[PDB]
């Protein structure tokens, strides 16, 4: 039997590589953390350092408040009782304000107003955060690829709890922070607009999600069978092809009628997925406002 | 008909069976015994897919569809039209994913690399099998499987799920869902990185596998590093699918009731089980 | 309606992405060559993209693809048949010759750098502060081939300084010289390193490095490659 380089067989360490530097302000860099012999069987064993700018704080700060505001209220419902808390942990839920309030900011604390608070923070913490991944990429004079891909999500997120909700007139159309509740919220939304198996921008999103699990499953299996040729180094194969990428290639082209490259395969991917939340943000964005039943429209196509 | 660097490879060998007999190409397509096989099965299949569309009385694809043998047949033979074909059409579909897997193997041998690929692939095979071979035999009835159809199999999913109410509650199916989510978040990145390392701001030198790392670390205080990621991925997926196949082999055989119910066991725990307040008191 | 519109228009958007994608993936390997290396008739439906330029680092230059395709070397292979798509016999010894599974590429005779500009791949004994931090250390351990005979021993491990990772095992052969082996192709155990790929007697054949403290990209390929090839040409002894 052979080595499947799934986990390394030997670990090795050296000092801490405090990372490149370029324009980055090393002042906001943190001190390095410890090395785990754990992650080490899988990937790096090095933890840290971490760049916490002003933005890094903001985002994280609102990040908690958000997460906290949800805690308080869960504590309220459990009647300040721990065991309860631990028992009904999943059924608790901070629901949006009521349909009557529509899109107003008067909603009484106990009915929506605490749900608004929490969202307010989540926004800020999601946008400020996106933002960081920009700058960091900039401090690295690197491709805003990442900063873009992420947006793709913020997309779906933005529709799911702000765009769509503003288009149906009321806060009561958004999702509630809850573990089982939102689960259902989904289910209902499915039934409330014909069946979603029909909404095509949903049939599509399925495709990609699925697709990303098909692709990624490949790229990895692949890279792995051609590491014994220093293939993991996709970067330096790009700039100076090796037998790694050649072999990566011919296997697929002798298999499925074609092939990618080492830079390329990375663009397939990137999209293959960026599109799950893209097609989506649409799909949902349409059901109800532009199409009240999806089965129907599966008959007329208008 | 060949890539610029294709010739220095096309040597003979790599055959698991038949020797050189089928050791050759056709278009950029490798062949081998299994190349053939998946041809045999595929065709034979596409054909019995045409007989049921006539026996069905239509040639619109979205409409075409072939159905399992109804519950009444059990786990035995069924008249063509009512399951019979569905049965041979599955056989074929099977022999062709399998063949298609082995051929891949021969390739990993002529190209002398890893078996990571077909291996990986063997999972989606499994996932398939569960559907048309495992779950059914335990629930004792072919019928329980899905219908090969463009929308009919969708409805096969829609009703089967709801047979257990909201399916979100089947927990094994929560798991499966997480992976199908991260995985994708993964590829999302790998691709954003690699490419944000490889296509820097205009005017600068390619970046380095070193820059990649620094990113994340300065972003989420950690890097799994280029080999790991590519390992992470293999897992995120194979798992995501390992589990699905799981939450289905259990639905109807060991848990068949309301899924959402299952979850009582937790709230119905001695200590807190009674206490008043919350949502279950 | 707005929904029909949007669903078509996406299709269009989707087609065009496919394009862009497909092309982008041809900056290498393309154009196709006939079985004698002369351009091909049918280049398919997709065109060669307009060349793009990579500004390599550490002044090592520029890369521009699509570029002028060159194997840059001799291929000891000949047709076994009259018509196309057949195998291509190895005139001699595929191992030495650099063909098939053993094939190796003409990549710069330079080594991979890290991002600071100092040699990416170094050998432990010179790697400052680098030690084995976990697992069965193979240093001093005996190397056994596929025929089950000893062939040398381990004297050092080379490591990816930046990615703190292990990629090779400097092996000292019977004749006092060393050969590098591909981690990913060895199976360290309790009392021995076991290489399935090669048998004792071919260990020598493993190509050598000019510098003992660094290895050039071109150099890695030749090794691994040779190593690989072992899987199929070394089988009559394994
Ligand atoms: C996983 C749980 C359910 C299931 C649930 C769903 C759900 C839910 C959805 C689909 C959807 C799809 N499913 Mg399904 N599907 C199942 C099992 C299968 C099997 C099988 C052999 O078991 C097949 C071929 C398919 C195929 C398909 C696609 C036609 C379509 C998705 C596109 C996609 O993302 O592809 C991923 C892979 C690729 C893009 C690769 C390219 C290969 C293409 C897709 C092959 C098409 C083959 C054609 C159907 C068969 C031709 C055979 C003839 C003999 C020539 N499903 C099981 C039973 N499927 C989606 C849909 O309805 O879209 C309109 C959708 O929303
Ligand atoms: C029973 C209900 C319906 C149904 C109803 C819906 C509904 C309703 C929706 C989907 C949506 C989706 N469905 Mg569905 N769906 C059904 C059946 C299926 C089947 C199947 C095989 O049967 C499949 C494959 C799918 C697949 C999919 C996906 C393609 C898509 C979601 C992508 C995603 O990952 O979003 C998840 C990704 C994100 C949320 C990314 C954004 C990340 C955010 C911003 C991060 C927040 C972080 C937080 C602040 C921090 C937390 C951690 C901190 C440490 C605290 N559905 C059934 C039939 N489906 C969604 C869609 O958009 O459809 C068009 C959607 O709205
Ligand atoms: C698009 C379709 C639906 C939808 C459909 C589904 C479906 C279907 C499933 C989930 C599941 C989950 N969904 Mg959801 N989900 C939607 C919108 C959201 C929103 C939001 C702000 O809009 C959030 C925070 C979540 C969050 C979650 C997770 C709790 C859980 C998945 C784990 C996972 O894969 O993690 C991946 C995470 C990462 C890669 C990031 C790391 C973050 C870590 C793991 C911490 C997460 C903490 C969690 C969010 C805390 C919740 C408690 C707070 C008090 C609110 N969903 C929309 C409305 N969701 C799955 C489940 O079963 O859960 C139990 C599941 O099956
Ligand atoms: C109301 C319905 C229920 C529900 C009921 C079910 C049920 C019931 C099932 C799933 C299953 C799945 N569900 Mg669900 N599911 C729901 C909601 C969701 C949501 C969501 C966001 O709401 C999500 C993300 C999912 C996600 C998922 C997936 C994890 C999983 C299917 C993937 C898989 O492994 O396929 C398996 C993949 C394969 C079989 C494909 C293998 C490839 C084959 C062999 C090759 C085909 C080749 C082709 C014919 C030829 C191509 C060649 C041509 C020339 C091109 N569900 C709701 C709540 N879900 C399924 C599962 O777990 O399956 C195991 C399942 O049975
Ligand atoms: C195709 C789209 C895919 C995708 C992409 C994606 N997600 C992304 C990105 C991208 C490209 C990011 O750049 C961003 C990221 O940063 O990723 C690493 C992100 C991200 N995707 C996330 C989640 C996520 N993505 C998902 C999905 C997907 N993401 C898709 C598959 C899903 C699911 C399950 O479908 C989830 C849950 C986030 C983790 C992350 C963006 C982070 C964010 O928005 O944060 C706001 C800030 C907070 C929540 C801060 C507080 C966190 C804790 C509550 C703190 C409390 C404890 C701590 C110990 C306290 C310490 C205190 C100190 C004082 C000591
Ligand atoms: C972790 C599991 C994930 C995964 C992995 C995966 N798929 C893989 C591999 C791997 C590792 C491959 O190596 C292999 C490949 O080579 O891909 C390029 C493949 C592959 N995954 C494929 C499809 C596929 N994978 C899917 C999913 C997934 N694959 C998961 C997300 C799905 C979805 C989303 O459901 C599909 C459709 C194939 C394109 C390809 C393998 C090629 C192949 O099997 O070819 C031979 C094909 C035939 C012989 C087709 C004809 C068959 C019969 C004669 C008739 C048709 C019968 C069938 C029942 C009809 C169904 C109709 C529906 C409408 C109901
Ligand atoms: C760096 O490395 C890497 C590469 O290299 C450069 C790669 O290319 C790839 C993979 C490349 C991609 C571009 C991914 C593309 C995305 C997908 C979603 C692909 C899956 C979809 C398909 C439609 C594939 C086509 C599949 C099939 C099965 C076609 C089969 C056709 C037939 C006619 C039947 C075959 C039957 C027989 C009998 C064989 C003999 C053939 C005859 C014609 C006779 C990866 C992952 C990689 O990491
Ligand atoms: C090659 O390059 C790299 C990529 O590809 C270009 C990547 O995609 C990623 C990131 C990849 C992931 C798969 C992480 C996201 C997935 C999850 C399932 C996260 C949640 C799971 C847990 C078991 C931990 C729950 C707790 C926390 C605090 C999660 C916080 C977010 C993370 C992304 C994990 C970081 C881990 C630790 C230990 C640091 C603690 C950080 C705090 C902010 C607190 C990395 C690191 C990388 O290096
Ligand atoms: Fe990659
Ligand atoms: Mn509505």
Curated annotation (Swiss-Prot), chain A:
Keywords: Bacteriochlorophyll, Chlorophyll, Chromophore, Electron transport, Iron, Magnesium, Membrane, Metal-binding, Photosynthesis, Reaction center, Transmembrane, Transmembrane helix, Transport. GO terms for molecular function: bacteriochlorophyll binding; electron transporter, transferring electrons within the cyclic electron transport pathway of photosynthesis activity; metal ion binding. Fe cation binds at residues 219, 234, 266. It is a multi-pass membrane protein. GO terms for cellular component: plasma membrane light-harvesting complex; plasma membrane-derived chromatophore membrane. Reaction center is composed of four bacteriochlorophylls, two bacteriopheophytins, two ubiquinones, one iron, and three highly hydrophobic polypeptide chains (designated L, M, and H). Its main location: membrane. This is Reaction center protein M chain. It is found in: Cellular chromatophore membrane. The lineage of its organism: Bacteria, Pseudomonadati, Pseudomonadota, Alphaproteobacteria, Rhodobacterales. The keyword Membrane applies. The chain crosses the membrane at residues 53-79, 110-139, 142-167, 197-225, 259-285. Belongs to the reaction center PufL/M/PsbA/D family.
From Swiss-Prot, chain B:
Its main location: membrane. GO terms for cellular component: plasma membrane light-harvesting complex; plasma membrane-derived chromatophore membrane. It comes from the Bacteria. (7R,8Z)-bacteriochlorophyll b binds at residues 153, 173. The chain crosses the membrane at residues 32-55, 83-111, 116-138, 171-198, 225-250. Residues 1-31, 112-115, 199-224 are cytoplasmic. A ubiquinone binds at residue 216. Fe cation binds at residues 190, 230. Pfam families: Photo_RC. Residues 56-82, 139-170, 251-281 are periplasmic. The keyword Electron transport applies. Keywords: Bacteriochlorophyll, Chlorophyll, Chromophore, Electron transport, Iron, Magnesium, Membrane, Metal-binding, Photosynthesis, Reaction center, Transmembrane, Transmembrane helix, Transport. GO terms for biological process: photosynthetic electron transport in photosystem II. It is found in: Cellular chromatophore membrane. It is a multi-pass membrane protein. The keyword Transport applies. GO terms for molecular function: bacteriochlorophyll binding; electron transporter, transferring electrons within the cyclic electron transport pathway of photosynthesis activity; metal ion binding. Reaction center is composed of four bacteriochlorophylls, two bacteriopheophytins, two ubiquinones, one iron, and three highly hydrophobic polypeptide chains (designated L, M, and H). Belongs to the reaction center PufL/M/PsbA/D family. The reaction center is a membrane-bound complex that mediates the initial photochemical event in the electron transfer process of photosynthesis. This is Reaction center protein L chain.
Swiss-Prot record, chain C:
It comes from the Bacteria. One of its GO terms (molecular function) is bacteriochlorophyll binding. It is found in: Cellular chromatophore membrane. Its cofactor is a bacteriochlorophyll; a bacteriopheophytin; Fe cation; Mg(2+). GO terms for biological process: photosynthesis, light reaction. Binds 4 bacteriochlorophylls per trimer. Binds 2 bacteriopheophytins per trimer. GO terms for cellular component: plasma membrane light-harvesting complex; plasma membrane-derived chromatophore membrane. It holds the Pfam family PRCH. It is a single-pass membrane protein. The keyword Transcription does not apply. The keyword Transport applies. InterPro entries: Bac_photo_RC_H_C, Photo_RC_H, Photo_RC_H_N, Photo_RC_H_N_sf, PRC-brl_dom, PRC_barrel-like_sf. Belongs to the reaction center PuhA family. Heterotrimer composed of subunits L, M, and H. The reaction center is a membrane-bound complex that mediates the initial photochemical event in the electron transfer process of photosynthesis. This is Reaction center protein H chain. It comes from Cereibacter sphaeroides. The gene is puhA.
């Amino acid at each position: 039997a052979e080595y499947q380089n799934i986990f390394s067989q030997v670990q090795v360490r050296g000092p801490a590589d405090l990372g490149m530097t370029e324009d980055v302000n090393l002042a906001n860099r943190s001190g390095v953390g410890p090395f785990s012999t754990l992650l080490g069987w899988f990937g790096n064993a090095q933890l840290g350092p971490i760049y916490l700018g002003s933005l890094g704080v903001l985002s994280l700060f609102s990040g908690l408040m958000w997460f906290f505001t949800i805690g308080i209220w869960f504590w309220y419902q459990a009647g300040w009782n721990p065991a309860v808390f631990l028992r009904d942990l999943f059924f608790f839920s901070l629901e949006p304000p009521a349909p009557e309030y529509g899109l107003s900011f008067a909603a009484p604390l106990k009915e929506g107003g605490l749900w608004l608070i929490a969202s307010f923070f989540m926004f800020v913490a999601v946008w400020s955060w996106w933002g960081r991944t920009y700058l960091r990429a900039q401090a690295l004079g690197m491709g805003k690829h990442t900063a873009w891909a992420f947006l793709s999500a913020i997309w779906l997120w933005m529709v799911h709890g702000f765009i769509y909700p503003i288009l149906e007139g009321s806060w009561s159309e958004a999702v509630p922070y809850g573990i089982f509740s939102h689960l259902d919220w989904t289910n209902n939304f499915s039934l409330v607009h014909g069946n979603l198996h029909y909404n095509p921008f949903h049939g599509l999103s399925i495709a990609f999600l699925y697709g990303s699990a098909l692709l990624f499953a490949m790229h990895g299996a692949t890279i792995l069978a051609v590491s014994r040729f220093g293939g993991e180094r996709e970067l330096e194969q790009i700039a100076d092809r090796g037998t790694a990428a050649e072999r990566a290639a011919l296997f697929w082209r002798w298999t499925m009628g074609f092939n990618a490259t080492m830079e390329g395969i990375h663009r397939w991917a990137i999209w293959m997925a960026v599109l799950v939340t893209l097609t989506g943000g649409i799909g949902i964005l349409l059901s109800d406002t532009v199409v009240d039943n999806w089965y129907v429209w599966g008959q007329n196509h208008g | 008909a060949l890539l610029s660097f294709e010739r220095k490879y096309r040597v003979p060998g790599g055959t698991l069976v038949g020797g050189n007999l089928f050791d050759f190409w056709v278009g950029p397509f490798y062949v081998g015994f299994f190349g053939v096989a998946t041809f045999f099965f595929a065709a034979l299949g596409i054909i019995l897919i045409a007989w049921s569309a006539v026996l069905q009385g239509t040639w619109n694809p979205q409409l075409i569809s072939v159905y399992p043998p109804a519950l009444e047949y059990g786990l035995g033979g069924a008249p063509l039209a009512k399951g019979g074909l569905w049965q041979i059409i599955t056989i074929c579909a099977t022999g062709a994913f399998v063949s298609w897997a082995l051929r891949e193997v021969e390739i990993c041998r002529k190209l002398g690399i890893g078996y990571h690929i077909p291996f990986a692939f063997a999972f989606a095979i499994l996932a398939y099998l569960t559907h048309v071979l495992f779950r059914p035999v335990m629930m004792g009835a072919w019928g329980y499987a899905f219908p090969y159809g463009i929308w009919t199999h969708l409805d096969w999913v829609s009703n089967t799920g709801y047979t257990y109410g909201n399916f979100h509650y089947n927990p094994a199916h929560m798991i499966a869902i997480s992976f199908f989510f991260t995985n994708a978040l993964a590829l999302a990145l790998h691709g954003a990185l690699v490419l944000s390392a490889a296509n820097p701001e205009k005017g600068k030198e390619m970046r380095t596998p070193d820059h990649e790392d620094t990113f994340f670390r300065d972003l989420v205080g950690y890097s799994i590093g280029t080999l790991g990621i590519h390992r992470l991925g293999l897992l995120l997926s194979l798992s995501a699918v390992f589990f699905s196949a799981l939450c289905m082999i259990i639905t109807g055989t060991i848990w068949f009731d309301q899924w959402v119910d299952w979850w009582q066991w937790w709230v119905k725990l001695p200590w807190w089980a009674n206490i008043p307040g919350g949502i279950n008191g | 309606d707005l929904a029909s519109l949007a669903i078509y228009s996406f299709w269009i958007f989707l087609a065009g992405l496919i394009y862009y994608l497909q092309t982008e993936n041809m900056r290498e390997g393309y154009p196709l060559e006939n079985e004698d290396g002369t351009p091909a008739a049918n280049q398919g439906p997709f065109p060669l993209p307009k060349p793009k330029t990579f500004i390599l680092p550490h002044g090592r230059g520029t890369l521009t693809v699509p570029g002028p395709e060159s194997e840059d070397r001799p291929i000891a292979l000949a047709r076994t048949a009259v018509s196309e798509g057949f195998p291509h016999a190895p005139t001699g010894d595929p191992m030495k010759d650099g063909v098939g599974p053993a094939s190796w590429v003409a990549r710069r005779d330079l080594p991979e750098l890290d991002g600071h500009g100092h040699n990416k791949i170094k050998p432990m004994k010179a790697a400052a502060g680098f030690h084995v931090s976990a697992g069965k250390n193979p240093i001093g351990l005996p190397v056994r081939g596929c025929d089950l005979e000893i062939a040398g021993k381990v004297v050092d491990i080379w490591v990816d300084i930046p990615e703190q990772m292990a990629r090779f095992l400097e092996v000292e052969l019977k004749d006092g010289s060393t050969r590098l082996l591909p981690m990913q192709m060895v199976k360290v155990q309790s009392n021995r390193v076991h290489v399935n790929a090669l048998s004792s007697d071919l260990f020598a054949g493993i190509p050598t490095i000019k510098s003992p403290t660094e290895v050039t990209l071109l150099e890695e390929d030749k090794i691994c490659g040779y190593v690989a090839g072992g899987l199929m040409y070394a089988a009559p002894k394994r």
